[PDB]
C-alpha cells in the first residue's frame, strides 16, 4: 500500500529498502510483464516497478564515489507506467522527477 512520494520517501531513509510492493524489471518480466500492452496489474497485482539502478548518463544527479542511483515509480496502480519516479542513493539523499528523468528535486 506504499506508493505515495512522502511514504516511500520516509520508508527509504528509515527502514533503507523500498516497501515489498515493490519489484524490478526483470522480477516483473519474468512474471509476464509486457511493457507494451500495459498489463502490470494483471500479472503483478498490487504491484510497482522500483529498485534497479539509474544510471544518471546525464550527470543530473550529484556524483560522488561509492554512491549509487536507485528509481522507483510513484502514484502507479494500473494500466501504461508513468512519468513519476523517486531517485534515492545510496547514502539516502531523495529526489523526484516528474517528466521523465528530465528534470530533478531534491525532497529530503
Known sequence: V??????????????????????????????????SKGNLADVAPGKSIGGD????????????????????????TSGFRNSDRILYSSDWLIYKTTDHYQTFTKIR
Request: without cysteine.
Open 2 to 35: 506504499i506508493n505515495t512520494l512522502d511514504g516511500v520517501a520516509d520508508y527509504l531513509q528509515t527502514y533503507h529498502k523500498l516497501p515489498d510492493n515493490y519489484i524490478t524489471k526483470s522480477e516483473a518480466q519474468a512474471l509476464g510483464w509486457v511493457a
Open 53 to 76: 539502478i539509474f544510471s544518471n548518463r546525464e550527470g543530473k544527479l550529484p556524483g560522488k564515489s561509492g554512491r549509487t542511483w536507485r528509481e522507483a515509480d510513484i502514484n502507479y
